[PDB]
Amino acid sequence: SHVKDILGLINAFNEVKKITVDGTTPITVAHVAALARRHDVKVALEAEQCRARVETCSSWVQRKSELQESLIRCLLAGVFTDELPATATRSAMLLRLNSFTYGCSGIRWEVMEALEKLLNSNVSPKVPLRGSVSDLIPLAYIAGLLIGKPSVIARIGDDVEVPAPEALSRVGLRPFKLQAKEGLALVNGTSFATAVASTVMYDANVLLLLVETLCGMFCEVIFGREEFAHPLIHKVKPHPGQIESAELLEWLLRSSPFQELSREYYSIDKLKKPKQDRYALRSSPQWLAPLVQTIRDATTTVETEVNSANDNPIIDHANDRALHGANFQGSAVGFYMDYVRIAVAGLGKLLFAQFTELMIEYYSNGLPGNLSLGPDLSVDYGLKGLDIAMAAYSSELQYLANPVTTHVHSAEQHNQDINSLALISARKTEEALDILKLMIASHLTAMCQAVDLRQLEEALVKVVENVVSTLADECGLPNDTKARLLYVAKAVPVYTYLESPCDPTLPLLLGLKQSCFDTILALHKDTLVDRLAEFEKRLSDRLENEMTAVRVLYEVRIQGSKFLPFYRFVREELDTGVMSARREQTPQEDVQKVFDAIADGRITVPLLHCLQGF
Amino acid sequence: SHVKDILGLINAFNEVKKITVDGTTPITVAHVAALARRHDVKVALEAEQCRARVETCSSWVQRKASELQESLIRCLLAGVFTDELPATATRSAMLLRLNSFTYGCSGIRWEVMEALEKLLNSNVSPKVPLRGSVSDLIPLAYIAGLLIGKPSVIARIGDDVEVPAPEALSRVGLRPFKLQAKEGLALVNGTSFATAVASTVMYDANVLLLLVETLCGMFCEVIFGREEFAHPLIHKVKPHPGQIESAELLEWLLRSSPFQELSREYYSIDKLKKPKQDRYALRSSPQWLAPLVQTIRDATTTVETEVNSANDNPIIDHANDRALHGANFQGSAVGFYMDYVRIAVAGLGKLLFAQFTELMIEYYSNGLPGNLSLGPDLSVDYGLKGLDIAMAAYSSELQYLANPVTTHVHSAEQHNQDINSLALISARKTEEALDILKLMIASHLTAMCQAVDLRQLEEALVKVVENVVSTLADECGLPNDTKARLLYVAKAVPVYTYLESPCDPTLPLLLGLKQSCFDTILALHDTLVDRLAEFEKRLSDRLENEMTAVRVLYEKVRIQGSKFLPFYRFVREELDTGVMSARREQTPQEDVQKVFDAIADGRITVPLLHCLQGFL
Amino acid sequence: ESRSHVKDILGLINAFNEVKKITVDGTTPITVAHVAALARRHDVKVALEAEQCRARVETCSSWVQRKAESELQESLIRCLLAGVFTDELPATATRSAMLLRLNSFTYGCSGIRWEVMEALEKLLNSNVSPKVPLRGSVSDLIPLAYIAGLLIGKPSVIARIGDDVEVPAPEALSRVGLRPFKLQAKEGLALVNGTSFATAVASTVMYDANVLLLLVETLCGMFCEVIFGREEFAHPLIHKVKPHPGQIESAELLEWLLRSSPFQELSREYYSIDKLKKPKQDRYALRSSPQWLAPLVQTIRDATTTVETEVNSANDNPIIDHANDRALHGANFQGSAVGFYMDYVRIAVAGLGKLLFAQFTELMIEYYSNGLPGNLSLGPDLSVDYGLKGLDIAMAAYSSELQYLANPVTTHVHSAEQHNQDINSLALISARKTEEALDILKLMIASHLTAMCQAVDLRQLEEALVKVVENVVSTLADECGLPNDTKARLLYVAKAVPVYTYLESPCDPTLPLLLGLKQSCFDTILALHDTLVDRLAEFEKRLSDRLENEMTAVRVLYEVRIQGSKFLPFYRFVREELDTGVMSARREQTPQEDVQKVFDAIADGRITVPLLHCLQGFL
């Protein structure tokens, strides 16, 4: 399954200490993400496997200086408005280094050692955002650093910023004097486009699994039928992503306490409730199928690019010739960044549709509008702000998923009449993921709210049942009338009348009055009316007070749910609670905490816990 | 290799007789295309294989239990004839609905499936509105409208006949069906139309892809490229499957090429004044094709999975006595991959446009004339300029089309369909995109054969100018040093830079000749001047006439050794075309039309398979 | 000065219907209504006027002829005949393109012979036009080459005479008493060097855009009437204070259309009963319509001006200044003005479609339709009447494709023609897409009007059904001998409860009618506190016998408020002229059969009759 592979990726991202750059051992998207985000991870350039092939190649080129330095000069052409982040630059530095290990570039080993040292020192040049059609200009800033160009500014850690010559001295390096072919070796790569795409693909894999898992949590809170994930439905339409996502979904909902409430809910008033769930849940495995396959396929393609000699000419020293091709063409990455962006927009649409169902009372199966706890709804608009936000997120996301590779210009004196635009495309897919992160944060926040509302719903109904039951005994109401009233206490959704339980124009008293008149006609063919009036009177004394007490006490079914790690993480570890008029905490403050957990990777802890033993 | 698979697809499309519909044997995109386009291809609904599970499921629904089904079809017959879905797509959809029923999940009667079998074989299909599906209730309601004999539904019988549905059933020996429980839903609740178009789209995408890959080699031959770009080491070290596989073909197509022999000769003369590397349209082609190849191959698998699936709801589990409520009617797998293919197709078109552009510009065509104009009178011959303009028009619309459709999902049908695939709309646009690619390939191929003729004439013309300069050097009694310089210039100068007026004192030949004469005077330092004066004098008497003669001979051969001979022989001989010039009266339209028609009806696969025979 | 864009569009519709002859003289402007008239009405003729322009044309012809002193011009035509037949540009577009090329010549800048212009005139009025390949133009060398090919009698060029006959170009010239032309100086270039085809399509695109716009604007008022909306949204002051000209003018129309509406009378009555359980404001699809329409109105009108400017221009090169003895080298062949505006209009057309989709969506959902049944089903048996659910799915399909089409074309410029045409307009491709967008918009307006006529019927049945329920309850309360205060409670419920919530089974104790009645019966018992229970039991008994059969009787009788509505023309047109009725299981016709009739009427412009009737009196 792809579920295991993404777990393998998350584990690798966490467990890795050294990234082996030897020319044999593959560098995954997890390893690139690790170097970029975790500063304790170091680069290990191994001499045993590639020092020989590299030096031979460097020797051949020399057997056949001002020229190579004036190429760098002209390619230092980007403008600072916003720039490429250090995470991206360092990833590109790693990827250019990795390209050299195959011994086709003819670069000196000494220069490769300098890259290794510069990475482990956290030194990286300030690189302008735009200029590459895919990565001559951005890679010329890495090359400019190695030759100690004063115009190129370099970072040392989070704070220090100095010119390149002084940066080289602080790490024990002297400015390089470029030999033949070396200048072209440095700038002629797909390193930047593939750097951004690597982190894009790691995040896309994590967030894909995250979205998949949260579909089960959505099922639990929306009172859905877990039937939609039955293996036979997907065996008979065997899209690999459809089967695998449903397999996870079936497993997550197998022993669900919320699904027990679901079956109980649809057993009462069966004819007046929907038989099938709406598409945002029931259609989820079919929707996820293409999205799963797109993100998995692109990972492979991105990894192939990471582990490749993307340079020109390809030096074939064993046959005394330089091979002329275009391995610097990032079309593999370019095109797959477009496909992924469309897949991400599809994940966003799934999230938007699910969130919309959750906010609307007519579709939320008992949940209050906007998930407003209230009870006073005139001063509690709940998650309406986030709902509006989700449409703003989805809308921009759909726009972003337009392709970039369809805008190829004839470039560079018409020499580059086809070019990938891979970096541009990767940046847009990165921007789309940022928006997807915003959407997952809000979704998870809302469902934790829905968990709380469902558990309180169970507690409030049981109170209404108790108060009606005891007062039926207290008022000496017959066995028939008691059964009718208890049914109404179980049937009508508490959130329809929570605002004012004893309001004569709200569903509870409405159903009660309808029952009382029905039981009068049945028992007729006078003191019953006296007993019923006393029941109504005493309900206005006890019900409101006891319903309030239970809610205030609340301010259990999740403890048996496989999504407990997510609920416990959001509520306990991030220090949040039920959203109401009484909690002095803006939705921003709540969602920001969840977003930050997703952005830094802390969300993987509850994710892995949730999926343990799958 | 994907090359093997596409050849396998082409072979199956050509040589299939019966499509086995049994619920175990897969139906490929080739089979779907074969049924749609070839009339003598029949459907084989094999009873022994799947009558059992179908009737087990059918009777299960009968145990658990008709005006309800009538109302559903009547409801969904809601399209408008503005445009219509072609019979090819409707018949493909009919086969795909039939195949879905064979899995024993739909609860439909075997009789209904038998009716679909005979309706297909009798070439009967309903008139279906183009639009209305979010993916395929409305379009599938017209197939169900036929089966129940709705008078408002019009059916086609072949190419000539269009009658109401009750009469259409009568003519093929069928009676209108009264629908049982679940049957009305079972007929309309599928991805049949979306997947039908997607199937023909995917077959075409494979054929045209291989065709574009092959013509990259032909482009190398005519543009005087370095076949080095296809060297296996360049691609093994950047091992994208599509990059390696495409390069493997191009290395093979260019091995021992007569045109590459000319290329080496061309670059050996005046090496330090010509492009050291080829431009990206050729050199970068394997890297460019890589994602496109993978996109089209992966999407072929996905569409074929949808073809061979039970896209229905509810899925009847008759063995465990329960009706499973899912959403197998959601064609998102198809919809998303149609968007991806369309982006890839746009990339294929961009490659072709870029190559075509190089070919048309003298600065980039390496000796070739602008617009590939033969002339010799260039003021009244503009060659392929018209086709050059149209190529930009094709590519422009192609790039526009490649915007995704799946990013425009609306919350639909009482917000019940809050996610829908729009697969049929997406497939339709990818279809339209492939029609444009066909237009581009047609022009591209035509421009290549034109370029073959121009290169071969270039050689014949050069051998004449050499022979004329050689003989006149003797007749004037010029020294062996002078003869060596003059024969060098005759070899070096591109013949098409002076073919308009060979003895014009301002054009490149006489310019180079007047340079050598002054170089040979200084080196040999006055009756030599009189011999050089007689050399120019006798040149303007014999040169133009002899160059004209061979051209005339040519208009009334290294492509013989070339592997692209089957293409050249197909365009020139089978399609009856010649070299484009003022003296040829056939329009660019008349020539390219013949090529396009051959691409459209599949005739082009013959020269393609001949070109690729022995490639393993 | 324009009084209102609504007056201007009505001006276009009148001009389209009334014109008999199109005057081509180089001074009198051709409008998008004229171009549409020629393309669609075969009785309309072209009149080339030899008084004003004949002199300047011949002067220009002579000057070019003098400066030259023939195969060159024929070779241009030969190489430009490079289209492929896969699909083709329809005769309407080609005939429009011929007129526009002819019109360009009248300015005396092209150097074309008057005889060629006379041939174009003759070919147009004879309904002769070449079959032109769809693609090839980056904007219109290749498509225009086929008009030029016809004039020189190229055997490969096929020509239509009317709708039936297809003959080669020499034979087509023969049948109209013309001989193939021999091209002189510049004449080859002068025929192909224009924006005629892009501007032809754009012209009938802009004419349709104007008509469909006004139609959409007007139908917003009809939507207000059926959805029970608050006309308050169109109040002048709201828009006076946010003074977008399209916003003011659309609201002005809507205020007028809703002023004395009998339907708006029902709206005020509806929101008076149970105020607290009903929305205070309408949803955006209606309330936000003038604001939404504002840029859409302005885009469509501004583009009409730009297209018309191109129509009445010398789109040719070089421009021959015979008065100052020199040829000026410019680029009037660049159709960028038409190109970019076609992109803007396509986005506006998508915007109009979104407005239609949203309004349609509210209408189909019971939670949003303010009393109307789901999918606008009549029933009463809702299990076999799914209503307009089919058209509702189609509306999502239509809108989704429409939003996709509204992506720009002008952003996809390739460096073309040996990098000489390094900026090209792509105007014809863009115009083609905007045309496709308007086709879909026609499908959307068709469904929308069909749905709203269904809604009118349902609202009028609603008023008939309720007053019967009121009558049955009122009389039984007297017969059963119930007190006046109890009678007032039960009559309130009869009026308050929406009728379509219980019409399926009126005397079902689980549906909202009996629920309210049982609620009120228990409340009255508590208020008057034994034989009262006997009288109430008799009330329930006699209601379950009498009510259902009477509700059916009035429903069958139905199978009035519109008669005072300004939308009566539309309702009568759809119902009487097109021969339709209320949609139910008792109606044999499919949704297709009904919507088709409305679509055809939109397509051939029959819809302008009820539109003009609906809007007469408006200033």
DSSP string of A483-544? HHHHHHHHHS-GGGTTT-TT-TTSHHHHHHHHHHHHHHHHHH--HHHHHHHHHHHHHHHHHH
The maximal CA–CA distance of chain B, rounded, in angstroms, is 117
- Angstroms from A408 CA to nearest CA on chain C: 9
Contacts of A517 in chain C (CB under 8 A): 518-519, 521-522, 525
Structural domain B1-191, CATH architecture: Orthogonal Bundle (1.10)
Integer Cα distance of A515 and A520 in angstroms: 9
- Angstroms from B323 CA to nearest CA on chain A: 10
> Partners for C (CB, 8 Å, 3+ pairs)?
A, B
C531-536: long-range pairs with CB below 8 Å, 24+: C533/A520, C533/A521, C533/A524, C534/A524, C535/C480, C535/C481, C535/C482, C536/A521, C536/C480, C536/C482
Q: What angle do CA B555, B556, B558 make, to 5 degrees?
A: 60
Is B609 within 8 Å of chain C by CB? no
> Partners for B (CB, 8 Å, 3+ pairs)?
A, C
Contacts of C367 in chain A (CB under 8 A): 362
Of B239, B243, B325, the CB nearest to A227: B325
Phi-psi category of residue B414: left, alpha or beta, with phi > 0 → left and psi -120 to 50 → alpha: left
Q: Regarding beta strands C21-24 and C45-48, do their DSSP bridges make them parallel or antiparallel, or are they unpaired? A: parallel
Prior bond of C133 cis (ω within 30°): no
CA atoms within 13 A on the CB side of C607: 24
Give the number of other CB atoms < 10 A from CB of residue B272. Answer: 5
How many helices and strands, by DSSP H and E, does chain B display? 24, 9
DSSP assignment of A225-246, as one string? -GGGG-HHHHHSS--HHHHHHH
Residue B140 corresponds to which tokens in the numbers above? Answer: 């599938």
Question: Are A408 and A419 spatial neighbours (Cβ–Cβ below 8 Å)?
Answer: yes
Integer Cα distance of C309 and A354 in angstroms: 50
Prior bond of A375 cis (ω within 30°): yes
Question: Are A36 and A196 spatial neighbours (Cβ–Cβ below 8 Å)?
Answer: no
Question: Are C106 and C313 spatial neighbours (Cβ–Cβ below 8 Å)?
Answer: no
Please give the radius of gyration of chain A, using alpha carbons only, rounded to the nearest integer: 31
Contact assignment for C523 to A513 by CB distance below 8 Å = yes
3-state helix, strand, coil in chain B (%, to 5): 65, 5, 30
Contact assignment for C519 to A536 by CB distance below 8 Å = no
* B79: Cβ contacts below 8 Å, ≥ 6 apart: B128, B129, B130, B131, B132, B138, B139, B142, C394, C592
Question: Are A506 and A468 spatial neighbours (Cβ–Cβ below 8 Å)?
Answer: no
Integer Cα distance of B302 and A292 in angstroms: 13
- Beta bridge partners of residue A149, listed in sequence order: none
* A87: Cβ contacts below 8 Å, ≥ 6 apart: A36, A37, A199
DSSP state of C228: T
Task: Give the chain A residue nearest C276 (alpha carbons).
Answer: A505
- Superfamily (CATH H level) for C462-560: Phenylalanine ammonia-lyase 1; domain 3 (1.10.274.20)
DSSP state of A265: H
CA neighbor of B186 nearest in space, from B110, B108, B120, B292: B108
Integer Cα distance of A420 and B153 in angstroms: 49
Give the number of other CB atoms < 10 A from CB of residue C546. Answer: 14
Of C414, C419, C525, the CB nearest to A529: C525
* A573: Cβ contacts below 8 Å, ≥ 6 apart: none
Cα separation values, A95 from A26, A58, A86, A419, Å: 12, 19, 14, 20
Q: Regarding beta strands A123-125 and A42-45, do their DSSP bridges make them parallel or antiparallel, or are they unpaired? A: unpaired
- Beta bridge partners of residue C421, listed in sequence order: C416
Integer Cα distance of C45 and C21 in angstroms: 5
Is A516 within 8 Å of chain C by CB? yes
Q: Would the annotation count A188 as a binding residue?
A: yes
DSSP state of A573: I
First to last CA, chain A: 10
- Angstroms from A208 CA to nearest CA on chain C: 26
Contact assignment for C84 to B592 by CB distance below 8 Å = yes
Contacts of C408 in chain B (CB under 8 A): 400
Q: Where in chain A is the domain with CATH 1.10.275.10?
A: 1-190
Contacts of A26 in chain B (CB under 8 A): none
* A434: Cβ contacts below 8 Å, ≥ 6 apart: none
Question: Are B210 and B350 spatial neighbours (Cβ–Cβ below 8 Å)?
Answer: no
Integer Cα distance of C113 and B59 in angstroms: 81
Give the helix/strand (H/E) hosting B429: helix B423-475
Is B417 within 8 Å of chain A by CB? yes
Integer Cα distance of C34 and C29 in angstroms: 10
* C436: Cβ contacts below 8 Å, ≥ 6 apart: C405
CA neighbor of A205 nearest in space, from A442, A11, A421, A456: A11
CA neighbor of B378 nearest in space, from B207, B474, B489, B501: B501
- Superfamily (CATH H level) for C196-461+561-619: Fumarase/aspartase (Central domain) (1.20.200.10)
Q: Would the annotation count B189 as a binding residue?
A: yes
Structural domain C1-195, CATH architecture: Orthogonal Bundle (1.10)
Q: Regarding beta strands C165-168 and A18-21, do their DSSP bridges make them parallel or antiparallel, or are they unpaired? A: unpaired
Give the number of other CB atoms < 10 A from CB of residue B63. Answer: 8
Please give the radius of gyration of chain B, using alpha carbons only, rounded to the nearest integer: 31
Of A238, A324, A416, the CB nearest to B305: A238
CATH 1.10.274.20 fits B458-557, yes or no: yes
CA neighbor of A47 nearest in space, from A72, A17, A24: A24
Residue B53 corresponds to which tokens in the numbers above? Answer: 């599970």
Q: Where in chain C is the domain with CATH 1.10.275.10?
A: 1-195
Is C444 within 8 Å of chain B by CB? no
Integer Cα distance of C132 and C148 in angstroms: 11
Residue that the structure tokens 């007490």 belong to = A549
Of A406, A414, A517, the CB nearest to C521: A517
Question: Are B423 and A417 spatial neighbours (Cβ–Cβ below 8 Å)?
Answer: no
Task: Give the chain C residue nearest A521 (alpha carbons).
Answer: C537
Question: Are C212 and C438 spatial neighbours (Cβ–Cβ below 8 Å)?
Answer: yes
Contact assignment for C526 to A533 by CB distance below 8 Å = yes
Question: Are C26 and C8 spatial neighbours (Cβ–Cβ below 8 Å)?
Answer: no
Residue A283 corresponds to which tokens in the numbers above? Answer: 């259609």
Residue C40 corresponds to which tokens in the numbers above? Answer: 């669609």
Contact assignment for A398 to B407 by CB distance below 8 Å = yes
Of C367, C510, C537, the CB nearest to A362: C367
The three-class DSSP label of residue B155 is: strand
Residue that the structure tokens 């009372």 belong to = A361
Three-class secondary structure assignment of B289-310: HHHHHHHHHHHHHHHHHHHCCC
Cα separation values, C304 from C30, C93, C209, C453, Å: 12, 17, 9, 32
Integer Cα distance of A248 and A610 in angstroms: 11
Q: Where in chain B is the domain with CATH 1.20.200.10?
A: 192-457+558-616
Integer Cα distance of A340 and B339 in angstroms: 11
CATH number for domain B192-457+558-616, candidates 2.40.50.100, 1.20.120.1750, 1.20.200.10, 1.10.1040.10: 1.20.200.10
Q: Where in chain A is the domain with CATH 1.10.274.20?
A: 457-556
- Angstroms from A516 CA to nearest CA on chain C: 7
Residue B527: exposed, middle, or buried by beta-carbon count in 10 A (0-12, 13-18, 19+)? exposed
Contact assignment for A304 to B279 by CB distance below 8 Å = no
Q: What angle do CA B366, B370, B373 make, to 5 degrees?
A: 115
Contact assignment for A294 to B237 by CB distance below 8 Å = no
CA neighbor of B582 nearest in space, from A282, C167, C71: C71
Is C141 within 8 Å of chain B by CB? yes
Topology annotation, domain A191-456+557-614:
Fumarase C; Chain A, domain 2 (1.20.200)
Cα separation values, C13 from C214, C348, C597, C614, Å: 11, 20, 21, 14
- Chain Cα centroid distance, residue B402: 16
Q: Would the annotation count B371 as a binding residue?
A: no
CA neighbor of C112 nearest in space, from C15, C224, C191: C191
Integer Cα distance of A201 and A213 in angstroms: 18
Phi-psi category of residue C580: left, alpha or beta, with phi > 0 → left and psi -120 to 50 → alpha: beta
Q: Where in chain C is the domain with CATH 1.10.274.20?
A: 462-560
Integer Cα distance of A444 and A438 in angstroms: 10
Integer Cα distance of A386 and A390 in angstroms: 6
DSSP state of C615: T
First to last CA, chain C: 14
Give the number of other CB atoms < 10 A from CB of residue B507. Answer: 16
Phi/psi at B93 (5° precision): -65, -40
Is A411 within 8 Å of chain C by CB? no
Cα separation values, A524 from A530, C531, C537, C538, Å: 14, 10, 10, 13
Contacts of B286 in chain A (CB under 8 A): 325
Q: Regarding beta strands A18-21 and A123-125, do their DSSP bridges make them parallel or antiparallel, or are they unpaired? A: unpaired
Please give the radius of gyration of chain C, using alpha carbons only, rounded to the nearest integer: 31
Mutation target for B interface from C403, C414, C593: give the one with most B CBs within 10 A.
C414
Q: Would the annotation count B385 as a binding residue?
A: yes
- Buried b or exposed e, range B450-489, using 16+ CB within 10 angstroms: bbbbbbbbbebbbebbeebbeebbeebebeeebbebbbeb
Residue C240: exposed, middle, or buried by beta-carbon count in 10 A (0-12, 13-18, 19+)? exposed
Integer Cα distance of B121 and B584 in angstroms: 46
Residue type, B386: G
Q: Would the annotation count B413 as a binding residue?
A: yes
Residue type, A514: Q
CA neighbor of A197 nearest in space, from A308, A346, A305: A305
DSSP assignment of A124-158, as one string? EE-B-S------HHHHHHHHHHHTT-TTSEEEETT
- Beta bridge partners of residue A44, listed in sequence order: A20
Return the CATH number of the domain spanning residue range A1-190: 1.10.275.10
Residue C99 corresponds to which tokens in the numbers above? Answer: 């007129």
Contact assignment for B330 to A230 by CB distance below 8 Å = no
Cα separation values, A187 from A67, A72, A107, A134, Å: 14, 8, 12, 11
Q: Would the annotation count C193 as a binding residue?
A: yes
Q: Regarding beta strands A321-323 and A314-316, do their DSSP bridges make them parallel or antiparallel, or are they unpaired? A: antiparallel
* Partner C, chain B 535-594, Cβ-Cβ below 8 Å: 582, 586-590, 592-593
Phi/psi at A283 (5° precision): -100, 5
How many helices and strands, by DSSP H and E, does chain A display? 24, 7
The answer to whether the Cα torsion of C345, C351, C352, C353 is positive or negative is positive
Contacts of A513 in chain C (CB under 8 A): 518-519, 522-523
- Beta bridge partners of residue C159, listed in sequence order: C130, C167
Find the DSSP H helices in B223-257: 232-236, 241-254
Contact assignment for A533 to C529 by CB distance below 8 Å = yes
DSSP state of B124: E
B486-489: long-range pairs with CB below 8 Å, 24+: B486/B513, B486/B516, B488/B516, B489/B513, B489/B515, B489/B516
Residue C530 corresponds to which tokens in the numbers above? Answer: 């034994």
Contact assignment for B343 to A343 by CB distance below 8 Å = no
* B415: Cβ contacts below 8 Å, ≥ 6 apart: A278, A356, A363, C365
CA neighbor of C86 nearest in space, from B429, B580, B440, B401: B440
A-B C-beta contacts closer than 8 Å? 230
* C525: Cβ contacts below 8 Å, ≥ 6 apart: A517, A520, A529, C532, C533, C536
Integer Cα distance of C441 and C350 in angstroms: 8
CA neighbor of C286 nearest in space, from C209, C370, C345, C212: C370
Q: Where in chain B is the domain with CATH 1.10.274.20?
A: 458-557
- Angstroms from A70 CA to nearest CA on chain C: 30
Integer Cα distance of B181 and C512 in angstroms: 31
Strands (E), A7-72: 18-21, 42-45
Integer Cα distance of A241 and A343 in angstroms: 13
The three-class DSSP label of residue A438 is: helix
Cα separation values, C267 from A46, B194, C230, C463, Å: 81, 44, 7, 12
Phi/psi at A593 (5° precision): -60, -45
Question: Are B140 and B190 spatial neighbours (Cβ–Cβ below 8 Å)?
Answer: yes
Residue numbers followed by a gap, chain C, C–N over 2.5 Å: 69, 86, 139, 529, 559
Is B487 within 8 Å of chain A by CB? no
Phi-psi category of residue C279: left, alpha or beta, with phi > 0 → left and psi -120 to 50 → alpha: beta
CATH 3.40.50.11540 fits A457-556, yes or no: no
Question: Are C596 and C450 spatial neighbours (Cβ–Cβ below 8 Å)?
Answer: no
Residue C575 corresponds to which tokens in the numbers above? Answer: 């119902």
Q: Regarding beta strands B84-85 and B128-129, do their DSSP bridges make them parallel or antiparallel, or are they unpaired? A: antiparallel
Integer Cα distance of C517 and C535 in angstroms: 14
First to last CA, chain B: 9
